[PDB]
């Protein structure tokens with residue numbers, strides 16, 4: 470089951486997202502606690518209802534630090550609502566772009582370990598995410614990153630593009646892209662390349678280059694996430710283990726991969 474919340478306990482305060490089938494609000498739940506609130510407004514279809522309550526059902530089956538926590542649902546009254554913990558810093562991709570250069574390498578790798586721990590939990594629960602990307606991670610005031618969006622060519626593994634094979638191993642590919650997004654403070658993967666140019670480049674063997682100021686071990690790990698052969702990629706358990714060891718021995722992050730500069734500045 471899922472906890473049913475009475476609408477008198479829910480106060481919507483500000484719109485923070487979505488729209489056209491409902492909105493996402495910041496609000497308070499009854500001292501009161503901050504929550505996020507997603508609505509499903511009148512006229513919703515049967516498929517929208519099973520998708521809406523399905524997301525709440527899927528989230529209600531999970532209990533992990535790096536997975537968005539469900540507070541409850543409003544299903545007996547209209548509009549229906551999903552109420553979750555409130556993540557004060559919003560989506561990770563936008564967050565990183567607005568905080569460019571403001572974190573330590575150790576902080577950035579800690580964000581990746583949390584995302585990986587969430588993904589290990591999901592994969593072991595037999596949940597394939599299919600849309601892992603910094604835009605679908607949320608960040609709270611403890612800098613904890615949590616996977617969201619339960620129920621994008623340049624985040625997607627080749628086998629998922631080519632023949633629709635989505636597995637935890639294609640989520641691992643996506644996690645490698647997320648690593649690159651985090652270490653670059655939200656750079657767009659493959660910059661201005663078109664979707665067709667990205668697929669072509671990947672098939673030809675090209676991979677995203679090293680971010681600036683990126684630990685050698687971190688670049689090596691994202692490169693292994695991008696193995697063409699699915700069976701050669703690390704499992705999330707391997708990823709979590711490696712990230713944990715690097716954080717525990719933080720001097721290991723001071724060895725940087727060489728950064729290939731695109732622009733030559735020479736001063737006499």
Ligand SMILES: Cc1cccc(Cl)c1NC(=O)c1cnc(Nc2cc(N3CCOCC3)cc(S(C)(=O)=O)c2)s1
Pocket residue numbers: 485486487493505506507524537551552553554555556557558559560607617618
């Ligand atoms: C309510 C809900 C229902 C189903 C699934 C989920 Cl994952 C949720 N919960 C959420 O969507 C959210 C929980 N916390 C959130 N914090 C949040 C907070 C913000 N901001 C807070 C700081 O000021 C900038 C905007 C922005 C976003 S968003 C929509 O642009 O990614 C999100 S959203």
